[PDB]
Amino acid sequence: KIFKPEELRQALMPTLEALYRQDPESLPFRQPVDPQLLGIPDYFDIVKNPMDLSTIKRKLDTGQYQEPWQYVDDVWLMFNNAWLYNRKTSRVYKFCSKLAEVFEQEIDPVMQSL
């Protein structure tokens, strides 16, 4: 703090990789939710700020996170969106919970190091 963009990316990238590595759990999250394609027009009435792994990656790659907490906020946004919109025993919700478990384990030592 100040953070160099490429060093911040290098430090955080493993934690995002860890989420992508989860198969099948990352699959609903590797791309944006498209409510039009899905036929769920209610989605954006509940999820005001969509977030997904492809968007986090793009932002990590293009200097969009000045500070590590802005990345952490985006990961948590993606989770909270899925946990608010979906039934607790749904696939998406269960898969989300797994990514959150993985993320909590990966991020702690990285934030401390930064």
PDB file of N, CA and C in Angstrom:
ATOM      1  N   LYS A   1       0.880  -1.209   0.000  1.00  0.00           N
ATOM      2  CA  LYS A   1       0.000   0.000   0.000  1.00  0.00           C
ATOM      3  C   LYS A   1       0.890   1.223   0.000  1.00  0.00           C
ATOM      4  N   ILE A   2       1.267   1.760  -1.166  1.00  0.00           N
ATOM      5  CA  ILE A   2       0.671   1.490  -2.494  1.00  0.00           C
ATOM      6  C   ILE A   2       0.982   0.093  -3.076  1.00  0.00           C
ATOM      7  N   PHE A   3       0.067  -0.420  -3.893  1.00  0.00           N
ATOM      8  CA  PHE A   3       0.219  -1.744  -4.516  1.00  0.00           C
ATOM      9  C   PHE A   3       0.576  -1.645  -5.998  1.00  0.00           C
ATOM     10  N   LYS A   4       1.595  -2.401  -6.402  1.00  0.00           N
ATOM     11  CA  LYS A   4       1.971  -2.480  -7.806  1.00  0.00           C
ATOM     12  C   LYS A   4       1.033  -3.452  -8.540  1.00  0.00           C
ATOM     13  N   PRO A   5       0.451  -3.011  -9.666  1.00  0.00           N
ATOM     14  CA  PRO A   5      -0.656  -3.780 -10.267  1.00  0.00           C
ATOM     15  C   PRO A   5      -0.324  -5.257 -10.569  1.00  0.00           C
ATOM     16  N   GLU A   6       0.858  -5.494 -11.105  1.00  0.00           N
ATOM     17  CA  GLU A   6       1.224  -6.839 -11.510  1.00  0.00           C
ATOM     18  C   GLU A   6       1.558  -7.723 -10.294  1.00  0.00           C
ATOM     19  N   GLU A   7       1.954  -7.110  -9.179  1.00  0.00           N
ATOM     20  CA  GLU A   7       2.304  -7.860  -7.967  1.00  0.00           C
ATOM     21  C   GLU A   7       1.044  -8.280  -7.208  1.00  0.00           C
ATOM     22  N   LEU A   8       0.092  -7.358  -7.172  1.00  0.00           N
ATOM     23  CA  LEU A   8      -1.213  -7.615  -6.630  1.00  0.00           C
ATOM     24  C   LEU A   8      -1.897  -8.736  -7.407  1.00  0.00           C
ATOM     25  N   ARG A   9      -1.817  -8.693  -8.745  1.00  0.00           N
ATOM     26  CA  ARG A   9      -2.408  -9.730  -9.580  1.00  0.00           C
ATOM     27  C   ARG A   9      -1.738 -11.088  -9.277  1.00  0.00           C
ATOM     28  N   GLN A  10      -0.406 -11.103  -9.273  1.00  0.00           N
ATOM     29  CA  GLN A  10       0.399 -12.295  -8.985  1.00  0.00           C
ATOM     30  C   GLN A  10       0.053 -12.912  -7.617  1.00  0.00           C
ATOM     31  N   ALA A  11      -0.181 -12.072  -6.618  1.00  0.00           N
ATOM     32  CA  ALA A  11      -0.471 -12.546  -5.264  1.00  0.00           C
ATOM     33  C   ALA A  11      -1.877 -13.157  -5.137  1.00  0.00           C
ATOM     34  N   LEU A  12      -2.853 -12.512  -5.779  1.00  0.00           N
ATOM     35  CA  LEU A  12      -4.241 -12.921  -5.701  1.00  0.00           C
ATOM     36  C   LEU A  12      -4.625 -14.055  -6.687  1.00  0.00           C
ATOM     37  N   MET A  13      -3.958 -14.114  -7.849  1.00  0.00           N
ATOM     38  CA  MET A  13      -4.327 -15.054  -8.923  1.00  0.00           C
ATOM     39  C   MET A  13      -4.491 -16.508  -8.467  1.00  0.00           C
ATOM     40  N   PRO A  14      -3.561 -17.024  -7.656  1.00  0.00           N
ATOM     41  CA  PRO A  14      -3.761 -18.389  -7.108  1.00  0.00           C
ATOM     42  C   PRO A  14      -5.106 -18.657  -6.396  1.00  0.00           C
ATOM     43  N   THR A  15      -5.631 -17.657  -5.714  1.00  0.00           N
ATOM     44  CA  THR A  15      -6.874 -17.820  -4.992  1.00  0.00           C
ATOM     45  C   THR A  15      -8.029 -17.911  -5.988  1.00  0.00           C
ATOM     46  N   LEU A  16      -7.975 -17.124  -7.051  1.00  0.00           N
ATOM     47  CA  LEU A  16      -8.972 -17.226  -8.115  1.00  0.00           C
ATOM     48  C   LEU A  16      -8.843 -18.567  -8.906  1.00  0.00           C
ATOM     49  N   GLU A  17      -7.594 -18.953  -9.210  1.00  0.00           N
ATOM     50  CA  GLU A  17      -7.318 -20.263  -9.838  1.00  0.00           C
ATOM     51  C   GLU A  17      -7.927 -21.389  -9.033  1.00  0.00           C
ATOM     52  N   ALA A  18      -7.762 -21.335  -7.708  1.00  0.00           N
ATOM     53  CA  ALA A  18      -8.337 -22.319  -6.842  1.00  0.00           C
ATOM     54  C   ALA A  18      -9.831 -22.462  -7.017  1.00  0.00           C
ATOM     55  N   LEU A  19     -10.530 -21.342  -7.224  1.00  0.00           N
ATOM     56  CA  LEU A  19     -11.952 -21.404  -7.432  1.00  0.00           C
ATOM     57  C   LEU A  19     -12.261 -22.043  -8.784  1.00  0.00           C
ATOM     58  N   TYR A  20     -11.532 -21.655  -9.813  1.00  0.00           N
ATOM     59  CA  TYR A  20     -11.759 -22.233 -11.153  1.00  0.00           C
ATOM     60  C   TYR A  20     -11.493 -23.735 -11.205  1.00  0.00           C
ATOM     61  N   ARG A  21     -10.584 -24.239 -10.349  1.00  0.00           N
ATOM     62  CA  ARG A  21     -10.149 -25.633 -10.336  1.00  0.00           C
ATOM     63  C   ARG A  21     -11.254 -26.564  -9.859  1.00  0.00           C
ATOM     64  N   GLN A  22     -12.261 -25.998  -9.199  1.00  0.00           N
ATOM     65  CA  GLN A  22     -13.325 -26.793  -8.596  1.00  0.00           C
ATOM     66  C   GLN A  22     -14.262 -27.216  -9.693  1.00  0.00           C
ATOM     67  N   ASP A  23     -14.364 -28.528  -9.842  1.00  0.00           N
ATOM     68  CA  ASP A  23     -15.182 -29.100 -10.875  1.00  0.00           C
ATOM     69  C   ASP A  23     -15.954 -30.210 -10.189  1.00  0.00           C
ATOM     70  N   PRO A  24     -17.302 -30.112 -10.147  1.00  0.00           N
ATOM     71  CA  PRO A  24     -18.155 -29.241 -10.937  1.00  0.00           C
ATOM     72  C   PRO A  24     -18.477 -27.885 -10.320  1.00  0.00           C
ATOM     73  N   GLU A  25     -17.967 -27.595  -9.111  1.00  0.00           N
ATOM     74  CA  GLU A  25     -18.516 -26.458  -8.336  1.00  0.00           C
ATOM     75  C   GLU A  25     -18.378 -25.066  -8.924  1.00  0.00           C
ATOM     76  N   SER A  26     -17.311 -24.821  -9.679  1.00  0.00           N
ATOM     77  CA  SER A  26     -17.167 -23.515 -10.319  1.00  0.00           C
ATOM     78  C   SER A  26     -18.085 -23.304 -11.524  1.00  0.00           C
ATOM     79  N   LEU A  27     -18.672 -24.383 -12.051  1.00  0.00           N
ATOM     80  CA  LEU A  27     -19.260 -24.305 -13.399  1.00  0.00           C
ATOM     81  C   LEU A  27     -20.384 -23.259 -13.556  1.00  0.00           C
ATOM     82  N   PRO A  28     -21.291 -23.140 -12.566  1.00  0.00           N
ATOM     83  CA  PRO A  28     -22.305 -22.129 -12.698  1.00  0.00           C
ATOM     84  C   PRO A  28     -21.749 -20.701 -12.584  1.00  0.00           C
ATOM     85  N   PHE A  29     -20.480 -20.588 -12.210  1.00  0.00           N
ATOM     86  CA  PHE A  29     -19.850 -19.300 -11.882  1.00  0.00           C
ATOM     87  C   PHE A  29     -18.791 -18.815 -12.882  1.00  0.00           C
ATOM     88  N   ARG A  30     -18.518 -19.613 -13.904  1.00  0.00           N
ATOM     89  CA  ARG A  30     -17.403 -19.339 -14.826  1.00  0.00           C
ATOM     90  C   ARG A  30     -17.795 -18.275 -15.860  1.00  0.00           C
ATOM     91  N   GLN A  31     -19.071 -17.906 -15.867  1.00  0.00           N
ATOM     92  CA  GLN A  31     -19.635 -16.968 -16.825  1.00  0.00           C
ATOM     93  C   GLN A  31     -20.799 -16.195 -16.169  1.00  0.00           C
ATOM     94  N   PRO A  32     -21.137 -15.007 -16.705  1.00  0.00           N
ATOM     95  CA  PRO A  32     -22.227 -14.247 -16.115  1.00  0.00           C
ATOM     96  C   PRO A  32     -23.586 -14.955 -16.221  1.00  0.00           C
ATOM     97  N   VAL A  33     -24.415 -14.713 -15.216  1.00  0.00           N
ATOM     98  CA  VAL A  33     -25.831 -15.092 -15.276  1.00  0.00           C
ATOM     99  C   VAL A  33     -26.490 -14.231 -16.349  1.00  0.00           C
ATOM    100  N   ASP A  34     -27.162 -14.861 -17.322  1.00  0.00           N
ATOM    101  CA  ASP A  34     -27.936 -14.152 -18.347  1.00  0.00           C
ATOM    102  C   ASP A  34     -29.403 -14.450 -18.118  1.00  0.00           C
ATOM    103  N   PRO A  35     -30.101 -13.537 -17.414  1.00  0.00           N
ATOM    104  CA  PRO A  35     -31.517 -13.798 -17.115  1.00  0.00           C
ATOM    105  C   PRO A  35     -32.404 -13.908 -18.326  1.00  0.00           C
ATOM    106  N   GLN A  36     -32.053 -13.255 -19.419  1.00  0.00           N
ATOM    107  CA  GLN A  36     -32.868 -13.324 -20.622  1.00  0.00           C
ATOM    108  C   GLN A  36     -32.832 -14.718 -21.200  1.00  0.00           C
ATOM    109  N   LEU A  37     -31.637 -15.299 -21.241  1.00  0.00           N
ATOM    110  CA  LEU A  37     -31.457 -16.652 -21.779  1.00  0.00           C
ATOM    111  C   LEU A  37     -32.091 -17.642 -20.844  1.00  0.00           C
ATOM    112  N   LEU A  38     -31.984 -17.381 -19.534  1.00  0.00           N
ATOM    113  CA  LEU A  38     -32.494 -18.321 -18.560  1.00  0.00           C
ATOM    114  C   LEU A  38     -33.988 -18.265 -18.389  1.00  0.00           C
ATOM    115  N   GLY A  39     -34.604 -17.163 -18.800  1.00  0.00           N
ATOM    116  CA  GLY A  39     -36.021 -16.939 -18.541  1.00  0.00           C
ATOM    117  C   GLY A  39     -36.310 -16.739 -17.060  1.00  0.00           C
ATOM    118  N   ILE A  40     -35.503 -15.905 -16.401  1.00  0.00           N
ATOM    119  CA  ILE A  40     -35.748 -15.532 -14.983  1.00  0.00           C
ATOM    120  C   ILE A  40     -35.662 -14.011 -14.869  1.00  0.00           C
ATOM    121  N   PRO A  41     -36.705 -13.316 -15.327  1.00  0.00           N
ATOM    122  CA  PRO A  41     -36.615 -11.873 -15.382  1.00  0.00           C
ATOM    123  C   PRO A  41     -36.520 -11.235 -13.998  1.00  0.00           C
ATOM    124  N   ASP A  42     -36.823 -12.008 -12.953  1.00  0.00           N
ATOM    125  CA  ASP A  42     -36.705 -11.500 -11.587  1.00  0.00           C
ATOM    126  C   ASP A  42     -35.267 -11.328 -11.090  1.00  0.00           C
ATOM    127  N   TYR A  43     -34.275 -11.844 -11.814  1.00  0.00           N
ATOM    128  CA  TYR A  43     -32.939 -11.940 -11.281  1.00  0.00           C
ATOM    129  C   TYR A  43     -32.370 -10.572 -10.893  1.00  0.00           C
ATOM    130  N   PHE A  44     -32.410  -9.623 -11.813  1.00  0.00           N
ATOM    131  CA  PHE A  44     -31.824  -8.311 -11.535  1.00  0.00           C
ATOM    132  C   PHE A  44     -32.626  -7.468 -10.552  1.00  0.00           C
ATOM    133  N   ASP A  45     -33.849  -7.880 -10.225  1.00  0.00           N
ATOM    134  CA  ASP A  45     -34.599  -7.243  -9.123  1.00  0.00           C
ATOM    135  C   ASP A  45     -34.094  -7.656  -7.731  1.00  0.00           C
ATOM    136  N   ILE A  46     -33.354  -8.748  -7.674  1.00  0.00           N
ATOM    137  CA  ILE A  46     -32.833  -9.278  -6.435  1.00  0.00           C
ATOM    138  C   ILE A  46     -31.300  -9.079  -6.409  1.00  0.00           C
ATOM    139  N   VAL A  47     -30.648  -9.323  -7.548  1.00  0.00           N
ATOM    140  CA  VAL A  47     -29.182  -9.204  -7.695  1.00  0.00           C
ATOM    141  C   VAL A  47     -28.876  -7.926  -8.474  1.00  0.00           C
ATOM    142  N   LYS A  48     -28.600  -6.865  -7.723  1.00  0.00           N
ATOM    143  CA  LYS A  48     -28.434  -5.541  -8.306  1.00  0.00           C
ATOM    144  C   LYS A  48     -27.057  -5.350  -8.928  1.00  0.00           C
ATOM    145  N   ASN A  49     -26.058  -6.073  -8.400  1.00  0.00           N
ATOM    146  CA  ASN A  49     -24.661  -6.004  -8.839  1.00  0.00           C
ATOM    147  C   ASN A  49     -24.155  -7.403  -9.163  1.00  0.00           C
ATOM    148  N   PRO A  50     -24.453  -7.897 -10.379  1.00  0.00           N
ATOM    149  CA  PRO A  50     -23.970  -9.247 -10.736  1.00  0.00           C
ATOM    150  C   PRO A  50     -22.478  -9.368 -10.661  1.00  0.00           C
ATOM    151  N   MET A  51     -22.013 -10.576 -10.388  1.00  0.00           N
ATOM    152  CA  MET A  51     -20.585 -10.849 -10.382  1.00  0.00           C
ATOM    153  C   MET A  51     -20.375 -12.339 -10.646  1.00  0.00           C
ATOM    154  N   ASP A  52     -19.310 -12.667 -11.366  1.00  0.00           N
ATOM    155  CA  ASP A  52     -18.961 -14.017 -11.702  1.00  0.00           C
ATOM    156  C   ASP A  52     -17.428 -14.104 -11.835  1.00  0.00           C
ATOM    157  N   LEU A  53     -16.923 -15.328 -11.941  1.00  0.00           N
ATOM    158  CA  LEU A  53     -15.481 -15.540 -12.032  1.00  0.00           C
ATOM    159  C   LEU A  53     -14.833 -14.922 -13.274  1.00  0.00           C
ATOM    160  N   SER A  54     -15.507 -14.975 -14.425  1.00  0.00           N
ATOM    161  CA  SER A  54     -14.946 -14.385 -15.647  1.00  0.00           C
ATOM    162  C   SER A  54     -14.747 -12.867 -15.498  1.00  0.00           C
ATOM    163  N   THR A  55     -15.660 -12.220 -14.773  1.00  0.00           N
ATOM    164  CA  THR A  55     -15.577 -10.766 -14.545  1.00  0.00           C
ATOM    165  C   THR A  55     -14.467 -10.406 -13.545  1.00  0.00           C
ATOM    166  N   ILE A  56     -14.359 -11.187 -12.457  1.00  0.00           N
ATOM    167  CA  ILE A  56     -13.278 -11.057 -11.463  1.00  0.00           C
ATOM    168  C   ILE A  56     -11.911 -11.219 -12.157  1.00  0.00           C
ATOM    169  N   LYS A  57     -11.772 -12.257 -13.002  1.00  0.00           N
ATOM    170  CA  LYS A  57     -10.529 -12.502 -13.785  1.00  0.00           C
ATOM    171  C   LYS A  57     -10.190 -11.324 -14.654  1.00  0.00           C
ATOM    172  N   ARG A  58     -11.178 -10.845 -15.415  1.00  0.00           N
ATOM    173  CA  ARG A  58     -10.941  -9.685 -16.295  1.00  0.00           C
ATOM    174  C   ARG A  58     -10.445  -8.472 -15.471  1.00  0.00           C
ATOM    175  N   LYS A  59     -11.106  -8.213 -14.343  1.00  0.00           N
ATOM    176  CA  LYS A  59     -10.756  -7.135 -13.439  1.00  0.00           C
ATOM    177  C   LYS A  59      -9.387  -7.352 -12.797  1.00  0.00           C
ATOM    178  N   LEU A  60      -9.074  -8.590 -12.428  1.00  0.00           N
ATOM    179  CA  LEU A  60      -7.731  -8.868 -11.908  1.00  0.00           C
ATOM    180  C   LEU A  60      -6.628  -8.635 -12.960  1.00  0.00           C
ATOM    181  N   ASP A  61      -6.935  -8.936 -14.224  1.00  0.00           N
ATOM    182  CA  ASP A  61      -5.987  -8.802 -15.319  1.00  0.00           C
ATOM    183  C   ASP A  61      -5.759  -7.367 -15.855  1.00  0.00           C
ATOM    184  N   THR A  62      -6.663  -6.431 -15.530  1.00  0.00           N
ATOM    185  CA  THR A  62      -6.722  -5.119 -16.188  1.00  0.00           C
ATOM    186  C   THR A  62      -6.638  -3.986 -15.182  1.00  0.00           C
ATOM    187  N   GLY A  63      -5.969  -4.269 -14.070  1.00  0.00           N
ATOM    188  CA  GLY A  63      -5.686  -3.261 -13.096  1.00  0.00           C
ATOM    189  C   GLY A  63      -6.910  -2.632 -12.456  1.00  0.00           C
ATOM    190  N   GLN A  64      -8.022  -3.372 -12.386  1.00  0.00           N
ATOM    191  CA  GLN A  64      -9.248  -2.787 -11.861  1.00  0.00           C
ATOM    192  C   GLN A  64      -9.338  -2.817 -10.359  1.00  0.00           C
ATOM    193  N   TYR A  65      -8.481  -3.620  -9.721  1.00  0.00           N
ATOM    194  CA  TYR A  65      -8.395  -3.701  -8.258  1.00  0.00           C
ATOM    195  C   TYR A  65      -7.101  -2.974  -7.810  1.00  0.00           C
ATOM    196  N   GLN A  66      -7.272  -1.800  -7.187  1.00  0.00           N
ATOM    197  CA  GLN A  66      -6.183  -0.958  -6.619  1.00  0.00           C
ATOM    198  C   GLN A  66      -5.653  -1.539  -5.293  1.00  0.00           C
ATOM    199  N   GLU A  67      -6.568  -2.183  -4.573  1.00  0.00           N
ATOM    200  CA  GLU A  67      -6.312  -2.774  -3.258  1.00  0.00           C
ATOM    201  C   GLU A  67      -6.962  -4.160  -3.079  1.00  0.00           C
ATOM    202  N   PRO A  68      -6.287  -5.066  -2.355  1.00  0.00           N
ATOM    203  CA  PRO A  68      -6.793  -6.444  -2.293  1.00  0.00           C
ATOM    204  C   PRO A  68      -8.234  -6.569  -1.803  1.00  0.00           C
ATOM    205  N   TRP A  69      -8.680  -5.689  -0.901  1.00  0.00           N
ATOM    206  CA  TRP A  69     -10.048  -5.790  -0.391  1.00  0.00           C
ATOM    207  C   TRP A  69     -11.115  -5.622  -1.473  1.00  0.00           C
ATOM    208  N   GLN A  70     -10.801  -4.931  -2.577  1.00  0.00           N
ATOM    209  CA  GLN A  70     -11.768  -4.720  -3.669  1.00  0.00           C
ATOM    210  C   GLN A  70     -12.011  -6.029  -4.425  1.00  0.00           C
ATOM    211  N   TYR A  71     -10.949  -6.853  -4.523  1.00  0.00           N
ATOM    212  CA  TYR A  71     -11.040  -8.211  -5.041  1.00  0.00           C
ATOM    213  C   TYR A  71     -11.865  -9.136  -4.130  1.00  0.00           C
ATOM    214  N   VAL A  72     -11.523  -9.117  -2.841  1.00  0.00           N
ATOM    215  CA  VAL A  72     -12.237  -9.896  -1.836  1.00  0.00           C
ATOM    216  C   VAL A  72     -13.739  -9.543  -1.859  1.00  0.00           C
ATOM    217  N   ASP A  73     -14.058  -8.247  -1.965  1.00  0.00           N
ATOM    218  CA  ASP A  73     -15.431  -7.742  -2.033  1.00  0.00           C
ATOM    219  C   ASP A  73     -16.167  -8.354  -3.233  1.00  0.00           C
ATOM    220  N   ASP A  74     -15.476  -8.486  -4.361  1.00  0.00           N
ATOM    221  CA  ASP A  74     -16.098  -9.010  -5.572  1.00  0.00           C
ATOM    222  C   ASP A  74     -16.389 -10.529  -5.474  1.00  0.00           C
ATOM    223  N   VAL A  75     -15.458 -11.255  -4.856  1.00  0.00           N
ATOM    224  CA  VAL A  75     -15.634 -12.668  -4.647  1.00  0.00           C
ATOM    225  C   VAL A  75     -16.871 -12.876  -3.741  1.00  0.00           C
ATOM    226  N   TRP A  76     -16.908 -12.156  -2.624  1.00  0.00           N
ATOM    227  CA  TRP A  76     -18.057 -12.169  -1.690  1.00  0.00           C
ATOM    228  C   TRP A  76     -19.383 -11.735  -2.298  1.00  0.00           C
ATOM    229  N   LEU A  77     -19.345 -10.807  -3.245  1.00  0.00           N
ATOM    230  CA  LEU A  77     -20.531 -10.364  -3.982  1.00  0.00           C
ATOM    231  C   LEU A  77     -21.092 -11.535  -4.795  1.00  0.00           C
ATOM    232  N   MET A  78     -20.218 -12.252  -5.489  1.00  0.00           N
ATOM    233  CA  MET A  78     -20.623 -13.390  -6.276  1.00  0.00           C
ATOM    234  C   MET A  78     -21.292 -14.419  -5.378  1.00  0.00           C
ATOM    235  N   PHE A  79     -20.695 -14.679  -4.229  1.00  0.00           N
ATOM    236  CA  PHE A  79     -21.297 -15.660  -3.301  1.00  0.00           C
ATOM    237  C   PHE A  79     -22.645 -15.193  -2.798  1.00  0.00           C
ATOM    238  N   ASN A  80     -22.657 -14.003  -2.227  1.00  0.00           N
ATOM    239  CA  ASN A  80     -23.874 -13.470  -1.633  1.00  0.00           C
ATOM    240  C   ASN A  80     -25.022 -13.387  -2.652  1.00  0.00           C
ATOM    241  N   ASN A  81     -24.698 -13.112  -3.922  1.00  0.00           N
ATOM    242  CA  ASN A  81     -25.716 -13.073  -4.980  1.00  0.00           C
ATOM    243  C   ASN A  81     -26.385 -14.450  -5.087  1.00  0.00           C
ATOM    244  N   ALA A  82     -25.569 -15.506  -5.198  1.00  0.00           N
ATOM    245  CA  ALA A  82     -26.057 -16.885  -5.314  1.00  0.00           C
ATOM    246  C   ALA A  82     -26.768 -17.337  -4.068  1.00  0.00           C
ATOM    247  N   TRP A  83     -26.279 -16.945  -2.898  1.00  0.00           N
ATOM    248  CA  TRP A  83     -26.948 -17.379  -1.699  1.00  0.00           C
ATOM    249  C   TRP A  83     -28.295 -16.656  -1.481  1.00  0.00           C
ATOM    250  N   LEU A  84     -28.472 -15.460  -2.046  1.00  0.00           N
ATOM    251  CA  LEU A  84     -29.717 -14.699  -1.877  1.00  0.00           C
ATOM    252  C   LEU A  84     -30.763 -15.180  -2.898  1.00  0.00           C
ATOM    253  N   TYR A  85     -30.308 -15.504  -4.104  1.00  0.00           N
ATOM    254  CA  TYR A  85     -31.244 -15.795  -5.192  1.00  0.00           C
ATOM    255  C   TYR A  85     -31.783 -17.213  -5.222  1.00  0.00           C
ATOM    256  N   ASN A  86     -30.977 -18.172  -4.746  1.00  0.00           N
ATOM    257  CA  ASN A  86     -31.180 -19.608  -4.925  1.00  0.00           C
ATOM    258  C   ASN A  86     -31.591 -20.335  -3.654  1.00  0.00           C
ATOM    259  N   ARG A  87     -32.319 -21.439  -3.843  1.00  0.00           N
ATOM    260  CA  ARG A  87     -32.736 -22.258  -2.724  1.00  0.00           C
ATOM    261  C   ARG A  87     -31.533 -22.837  -2.077  1.00  0.00           C
ATOM    262  N   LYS A  88     -31.607 -23.024  -0.749  1.00  0.00           N
ATOM    263  CA  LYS A  88     -30.454 -23.520  -0.008  1.00  0.00           C
ATOM    264  C   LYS A  88     -29.913 -24.912  -0.477  1.00  0.00           C
ATOM    265  N   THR A  89     -30.821 -25.826  -0.829  1.00  0.00           N
ATOM    266  CA  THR A  89     -30.424 -27.150  -1.308  1.00  0.00           C
ATOM    267  C   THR A  89     -30.270 -27.210  -2.825  1.00  0.00           C
ATOM    268  N   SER A  90     -30.402 -26.087  -3.523  1.00  0.00           N
ATOM    269  CA  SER A  90     -30.145 -26.075  -4.954  1.00  0.00           C
ATOM    270  C   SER A  90     -28.658 -26.383  -5.224  1.00  0.00           C
ATOM    271  N   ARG A  91     -28.395 -26.924  -6.410  1.00  0.00           N
ATOM    272  CA  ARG A  91     -27.054 -27.082  -6.959  1.00  0.00           C
ATOM    273  C   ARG A  91     -26.201 -25.788  -6.903  1.00  0.00           C
ATOM    274  N   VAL A  92     -26.718 -24.682  -7.408  1.00  0.00           N
ATOM    275  CA  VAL A  92     -25.988 -23.437  -7.407  1.00  0.00           C
ATOM    276  C   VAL A  92     -25.575 -22.989  -5.993  1.00  0.00           C
ATOM    277  N   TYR A  93     -26.489 -23.093  -5.045  1.00  0.00           N
ATOM    278  CA  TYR A  93     -26.251 -22.723  -3.642  1.00  0.00           C
ATOM    279  C   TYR A  93     -25.199 -23.662  -3.028  1.00  0.00           C
ATOM    280  N   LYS A  94     -25.385 -24.967  -3.195  1.00  0.00           N
ATOM    281  CA  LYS A  94     -24.405 -25.936  -2.637  1.00  0.00           C
ATOM    282  C   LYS A  94     -23.029 -25.710  -3.267  1.00  0.00           C
ATOM    283  N   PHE A  95     -23.010 -25.410  -4.567  1.00  0.00           N
ATOM    284  CA  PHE A  95     -21.747 -25.226  -5.288  1.00  0.00           C
ATOM    285  C   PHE A  95     -21.081 -23.950  -4.822  1.00  0.00           C
ATOM    286  N   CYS A  96     -21.905 -22.903  -4.641  1.00  0.00           N
ATOM    287  CA  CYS A  96     -21.441 -21.643  -4.083  1.00  0.00           C
ATOM    288  C   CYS A  96     -20.762 -21.845  -2.715  1.00  0.00           C
ATOM    289  N   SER A  97     -21.414 -22.584  -1.834  1.00  0.00           N
ATOM    290  CA  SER A  97     -20.858 -22.877  -0.485  1.00  0.00           C
ATOM    291  C   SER A  97     -19.472 -23.545  -0.550  1.00  0.00           C
ATOM    292  N   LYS A  98     -19.309 -24.460  -1.487  1.00  0.00           N
ATOM    293  CA  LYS A  98     -18.013 -25.062  -1.695  1.00  0.00           C
ATOM    294  C   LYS A  98     -16.949 -24.031  -2.126  1.00  0.00           C
ATOM    295  N   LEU A  99     -17.245 -23.177  -3.111  1.00  0.00           N
ATOM    296  CA  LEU A  99     -16.294 -22.133  -3.539  1.00  0.00           C
ATOM    297  C   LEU A  99     -15.918 -21.240  -2.348  1.00  0.00           C
ATOM    298  N   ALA A 100     -16.900 -20.884  -1.503  1.00  0.00           N
ATOM    299  CA  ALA A 100     -16.665 -20.028  -0.333  1.00  0.00           C
ATOM    300  C   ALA A 100     -15.744 -20.688   0.687  1.00  0.00           C
ATOM    301  N   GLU A 101     -15.947 -21.980   0.915  1.00  0.00           N
ATOM    302  CA  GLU A 101     -15.030 -22.787   1.740  1.00  0.00           C
ATOM    303  C   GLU A 101     -13.598 -22.781   1.202  1.00  0.00           C
ATOM    304  N   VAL A 102     -13.466 -23.043  -0.082  1.00  0.00           N
ATOM    305  CA  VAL A 102     -12.156 -23.004  -0.723  1.00  0.00           C
ATOM    306  C   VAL A 102     -11.555 -21.594  -0.606  1.00  0.00           C
ATOM    307  N   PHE A 103     -12.353 -20.583  -0.897  1.00  0.00           N
ATOM    308  CA  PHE A 103     -11.843 -19.209  -0.897  1.00  0.00           C
ATOM    309  C   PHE A 103     -11.360 -18.789   0.497  1.00  0.00           C
ATOM    310  N   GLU A 104     -12.157 -19.074   1.522  1.00  0.00           N
ATOM    311  CA  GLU A 104     -11.760 -18.723   2.914  1.00  0.00           C
ATOM    312  C   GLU A 104     -10.385 -19.301   3.293  1.00  0.00           C
ATOM    313  N   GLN A 105     -10.150 -20.557   2.917  1.00  0.00           N
ATOM    314  CA  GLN A 105      -8.847 -21.220   3.117  1.00  0.00           C
ATOM    315  C   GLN A 105      -7.677 -20.588   2.364  1.00  0.00           C
ATOM    316  N   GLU A 106      -7.898 -20.243   1.098  1.00  0.00           N
ATOM    317  CA  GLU A 106      -6.847 -19.671   0.220  1.00  0.00           C
ATOM    318  C   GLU A 106      -6.495 -18.191   0.527  1.00  0.00           C
ATOM    319  N   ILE A 107      -7.508 -17.384   0.840  1.00  0.00           N
ATOM    320  CA  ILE A 107      -7.350 -15.928   0.955  1.00  0.00           C
ATOM    321  C   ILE A 107      -6.669 -15.474   2.248  1.00  0.00           C
ATOM    322  N   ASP A 108      -6.959 -16.132   3.364  1.00  0.00           N
ATOM    323  CA  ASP A 108      -6.411 -15.753   4.665  1.00  0.00           C
ATOM    324  C   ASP A 108      -4.885 -15.529   4.655  1.00  0.00           C
ATOM    325  N   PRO A 109      -4.087 -16.562   4.308  1.00  0.00           N
ATOM    326  CA  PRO A 109      -2.631 -16.303   4.312  1.00  0.00           C
ATOM    327  C   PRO A 109      -2.183 -15.265   3.267  1.00  0.00           C
ATOM    328  N   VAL A 110      -2.890 -15.181   2.136  1.00  0.00           N
ATOM    329  CA  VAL A 110      -2.542 -14.198   1.119  1.00  0.00           C
ATOM    330  C   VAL A 110      -2.774 -12.762   1.607  1.00  0.00           C
ATOM    331  N   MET A 111      -3.885 -12.516   2.295  1.00  0.00           N
ATOM    332  CA  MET A 111      -4.162 -11.155   2.798  1.00  0.00           C
ATOM    333  C   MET A 111      -3.152 -10.731   3.858  1.00  0.00           C
ATOM    334  N   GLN A 112      -2.845 -11.660   4.761  1.00  0.00           N
ATOM    335  CA  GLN A 112      -1.825 -11.449   5.779  1.00  0.00           C
ATOM    336  C   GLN A 112      -0.481 -11.085   5.143  1.00  0.00           C
ATOM    337  N   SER A 113      -0.102 -11.807   4.084  1.00  0.00           N
ATOM    338  CA  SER A 113       1.174 -11.558   3.399  1.00  0.00           C
ATOM    339  C   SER A 113       1.205 -10.174   2.734  1.00  0.00           C
ATOM    340  N   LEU A 114       0.049  -9.736   2.246  1.00  0.00           N
ATOM    341  CA  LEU A 114      -0.106  -8.424   1.633  1.00  0.00           C
ATOM    342  C   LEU A 114      -0.367  -7.394   2.730  1.00  0.00           C
TER     343      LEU A 114
END
